[PDB]
Every structure is written in structure tokens, then in C-alpha cells.
């Protein structure tokens, strides 16, 4: 129409006029035409027009004009041809500069237009990075308009995804603290969701990870684990899990831990899986977290989770590991050991020692049984579940393997050590000692005494020591030629090896 031949060209000329007064006027007019389809297409198809709009926007000093030109670009970004024209007109560098604007209407137009470019315009991410958009966006995270923040945070997510360089710049700009602040301050679901995704992306970066944890990320994300928004909850859980292997030294974790224990009961497999993984890492060598998890009913919840999981190892492995952690080295380890039995967990625990369980799971299960055996009340029931013959079978097969490396990321040396270690504790009970000896294991334990691995030597000497507390067994051990290899262990730097070995010798001769 007359749009292309007269309208657009006239307006684009007016936008370059010296008397900016006639400019603010042209700006207004163009903005209006952009609001209507017909004239919007005429505008986007005119490189001169688009250029005049960009130029004017980043040079004006008249707010009404800055807003109209930015709004114009905003309306154009809705279309493919518009996105390209802005891009080719050098609009990105201009828009980014507009993120320093004191006018809210201008910032909203600029950020949304950039968001559209980042989402659909090829080459946009590089252009924004080069214009220093990451630093500008992070600095804007102190604003309070939640829809504005939701767009800005999403821009950061798009820019940071799979781009280390960008993740480090966000880190250097104080991104972690700014994002965590948002998670603790606002309640707008869309903003919490977009912010959690930025945090998730950063949580896989070895540099951002510690920073997010130090900024209070663990606790902040934990505040939303019960939100009705499933997308929000899941993204928080994913970020939490990524960060969990580096937060075993944070405090004020009571609430997070309490909620995680509750999530173990979820019908959402991904929620339970993530919750088990996070709990397993947070109870790893942290007695306070161990204490709190047991306090809020974690043992029962974990046992139930293992029962429900069946053969699903993505759940049982971390859950069994959490249980292993929880039944060891802390004021409430003994009650935990008892609780596992009280909540009907012994049967399934022992069950996990058998196929289809894979090695990683078997390894964790043996470690758990070893801790459970520290509780005398678990001696008989563990025996009655057939744990001993299976532990012996695992031991014998693994040893034979080391004599003929990582099988599924597990060395058989570890299985030999673990099973012998569980038998060492189980041997505290007289009836278990009878089963153990009846499986003709003494000759094997004696051979393990020659193992070049100190930890294996310790548990081998250990189980023979327990077995030797019965006269008949001590005689049988001596009859197996244990004296020589034991004597050789007397000078070990390992107190356990030296003590157990000496004890067997005193018991054999007494």
C-alpha cells in the first residue's frame, strides 16, 4: 500500500531529523503503526526504518521516545522477519545498552525483546554475550517486578545452558547470591521456576556449585519442596542433588532434611529417587545430619522406600547407602540399627544381596548389614533370613576372582573385605559362629590372612578372633595352620590387625 512507498520512508526520514522534537513525534507515530499488523510488516521490511528506530532508541534523551522505539522493536520481535531485521540492524548491542535505562517501561521492552531473540534468533546468544549482556542482566536481579525478573532469569538460563564461559561470568557478577536471594524472597511461581532452572544449570559447574552452597542455596531451594507446582519442585530437587555432594558442611538444614524425609513417601518416582540421592549425600560423614534425619523418622521412611522400590536400583542404591550412613558413627546409630528391624526392613535388606541386584547395590547392602549386625537384637533375624550363606558365597566367589578390575565400578577386593567385615560382626553371636564354621570358611579366612591388602587382613584376623572365643573353633583354626600367617601380622602398623592376630594366637594356645 502507501505504507511502503510513502509512510515508512517519510517516517524513517523524520526519525533522523535534527530537531529531536520532530523525532519524539515520529517515534510515537511509528510505535502506533507497529501496533497494527499491516503497518508492522511495512516497518520490519524496511532496513532503513528498523535502523532509524534502533539508532533513535539508544540516542534519545526523551523517555517517551525511548519507550516508543523500544516498544516498536518489541512488537517486531514477535515475527521472524522482525527478529532478523533487529538482529541485522545491530539491535542487540542497542537493546543491551537499554538495560541500563532508569525507565521501567524501557527495561521491560528491552529485556522481552532480547528474550525473544535469545529464544528464536540464530546468533543471538553470542551477540548478547559480546555486548556484556550477562553482567547487565545479573545486575538487574535486584529489581522487584516479578514478571520482569522471570524474563531476565530465563534469559540467563538460555545464555548459561551448556556454556562454561557464561557460567563463570554469571558467577563473577554475583549471580549465585542474587539467584538464591530471589528463591528466598518471592512467591511468584513462574519466577521461582525460571530461577531454579538457572540454578540447576549453574549447579553442574565446579565453580558455581560451592558458591551456590555458600550463598545458602541448599536451604533456599528446600523452601519450595512442598509447592503445588510439580515443575518447580522437581527442578529444585535436581539442583539440590547436583549440589548435595558439596554441602555436607552446611547448617540450618533441619527443615530441608525434614521435607526430604517426607518426599520419600511420594508416589512420584522422580521425587523419591532424588530425595533418596540427596539424603544419602547429606548423611555422608555428617553426624548432625544423621541425627536429624533419624529424629524425623528417616529410618522408617527409608525402609518403606526400599520396600516399595523393589528391583529399581536408582532408588534402592542411594536409599541403602543412606541407611548405611544412618546406622553408623553417631549418637543415635544404635536406635537406627534397631529401628530398621522394628520397621520390618531386615527381610528386604538381605533380599538385596541376591540377583537381580547389581554390584554397586550389593556393596552398599553388605555395608549396611555390617552396621545392622552391631545390634545384638539383629543377630538372630539376620541369620534367619539366610544372610550368612549368601555373604559367604559372595566372599568365596569374589576372592576366587581376585586370584584368577572394576566390575560395574566395583573391585572384588571390596566385596571380599566387605563380606568378611560383616561376618566379623555377625560372628559375635554363638549361633552365627556355628553357621559360619559349618560353611567350612576357616580355611578361607586363614588364606585371607596372606592378603596384601591391610583392610582384608584386619577383618580376616577379626573373624578368626571371634570364632576363636569358642574352644573347639580355636583348635580348628590352629589345625588349619593359622599360626604362621598370624605371627607375620604381629608387627603391622594397623592396631586392629596386630591386636586380632595376637588374640587368635593367645586363644589357640590357651
Amino acid at each position: 500500500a502507501e505504507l511502503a512507498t510513502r509512510a515508512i520512508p517519510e517516517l524513517t526520514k523524520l526519525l533522523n531529523d535534527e530537531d529531536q522534537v520532530v523525532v519524539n513525534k515520529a517515534a510515537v507515530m511509528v510505535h502506533q503503526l507497529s501496533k497494527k499488523e499491516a503497518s508492522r510488516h511495512a516497518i520490519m521490511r524496511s532496513p532503513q526504518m528498523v535502523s532509524a528506530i534502533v539508532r533513535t532508541m539508544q540516542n534519545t534523551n526523551d523517555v517517551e521516545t525511548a519507550r516508543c522505539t523500544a516498544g516498536t522493536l518489541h512488537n517486531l520481535s514477535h515475527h521472524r522477519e522482525g527478529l532478523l531485521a533487529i538482529f541485522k540492524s545491530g539491535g542487540i548491542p542497542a537493546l543491551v545498552k537499554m538495560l541500563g535505562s532508569p525507565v521501567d517501561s524501557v527495561l521491560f521492552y528491552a529485556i522481552t525483546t532480547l528474550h525473544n531473540l535469545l529464544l528464536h534468533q540464530e546468533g543471538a546468544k553470542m551477540a548478547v554475550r559480546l555486548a556484556g549482556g550477562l553482567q547487565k542482566m545479573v545486575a538487574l536481579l535486584n529489581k522487584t517486578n516479578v514478571k520482569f525478573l522471570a524474563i531476565t532469569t530465563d534469559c540467563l538460563q538460555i545464555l548459561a545452558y551448556g556454556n562454561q564461559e557464561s557460567k563463570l561470568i554469571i558467577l563473577a557478577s554475583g549471580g549465585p547470591q542474587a539467584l538464591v536471594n530471589i528463591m528466598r524472597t518471592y512467591t511468584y511461581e513462574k519466577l521461582l521456576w525460571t530461577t531454579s532452572r538457572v540454578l540447576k544449570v549453574l549447579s553442574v559447574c565446579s565453580s558455581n556449585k560451592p558458591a551456590i552452597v555458600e550463598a545458602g542455596g541448599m536451604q533456599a531451594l528446600g523452601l519450595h519442596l512442598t509447592d503445588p507446582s510439580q515443575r518447580l519442585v522437581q527442578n529444585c530437587l535436581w539442583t539440590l542433588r547436583n549440589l548435595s555432594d558439596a554441602a555436607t558442611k552446611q547448617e540450618g538444614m533441619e527443615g530441608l532434611l525434614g521435607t526430604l524425609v517426607q518426599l520419600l513417601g511420594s508416589d512420584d518416582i522422580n521425587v523419591v529417587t532424588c530425595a533418596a540421592g540427596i539424603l544419602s549425600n547429606l548423611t555422608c560423614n555428617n553426624y548432625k545430619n544423621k541425627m536429624m534425619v533419624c529424629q524425623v523418622g528417616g529410618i522408617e521412611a527409608l525402609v518403606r522406600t526400599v520396600l516399595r522400590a523393589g528391583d529399581r536400583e536408582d532408588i534402592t542404591e542411594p536409599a541403602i547407602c543412606a541407611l548405611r550412613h544412618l546406622t553408623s558413627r553417631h549418637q543415635e546409630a544404635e536406635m537406627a540399627q534397631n529401628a530398621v528391624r522394628l520397621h520390618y526392613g531386615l527381610p528386604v535388606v538381605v533380599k538385596l544381596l541376591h540377583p537381580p541386584s547389581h554390584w554397586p547395590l550389593i556393596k552398599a547392602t553388605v555395608g549396611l548389614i555390617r552396621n545392622l549386625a552391631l545390634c545384638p537384637a539383629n543377630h538372630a533375624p539376620l541369620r534367619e533370613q539366610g544372610a550368612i550363606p549368601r555373604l559367604v558365597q559372595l566372599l568365596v566367589r569374589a576372592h576366587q576372582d581376585t586370584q584368577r578390575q572394576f566390575v560395574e565400578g566395583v573391585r572384588m577386593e571390596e566385596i571380599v573385605e566387605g563380606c568378611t567385615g560383616a561376618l566379623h560382626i555377625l560372628a559375635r553371636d554363638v549361633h552365627n559362629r556355628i553357621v559360619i564354621r559349618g560353611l567350612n570358611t576357616i580355611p578361607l579366612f586363614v588364606q585371607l590372612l596372606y592378603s596384601p591388602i591391610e583392610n582384608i587382613q584386619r577383618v580376616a584376623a577379626g573373624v578368626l578372633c571371634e570364632l576363636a572365643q569358642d574352644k573347639e573353633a580355636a583348635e580348628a583354626i590352629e589345625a588349619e595352620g593359622a599360626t604362621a600367617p598370624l605371627t607375620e601380622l604381629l608387627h603391622s602398623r594397623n592396631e586392629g590387625v596386630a591386636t586380632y592376630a595376637a588374640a587368635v594366637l593367645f586363644r589357640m594356645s590357651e
Binding site: G162, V204, N242, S244, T248, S280, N281, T283, E317, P318
Partner: peptide
């Protein structure tokens, strides 16, 4: 038998 860590790195969606 010390406590062990599980290393996760979900940047998008586990699958």
C-alpha cells in the same frame, strides 16, 4: 567402610 558420596550432574533432564 566410611560413608560415600554419589555424584550427580543433571543440567537439563535425566534420561
Amino acid at each position: 567402610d566410611a560413608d560415600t558420596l554419589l555424584h550427580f550432574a543433571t543440567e537439563s533432564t535425566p534420561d
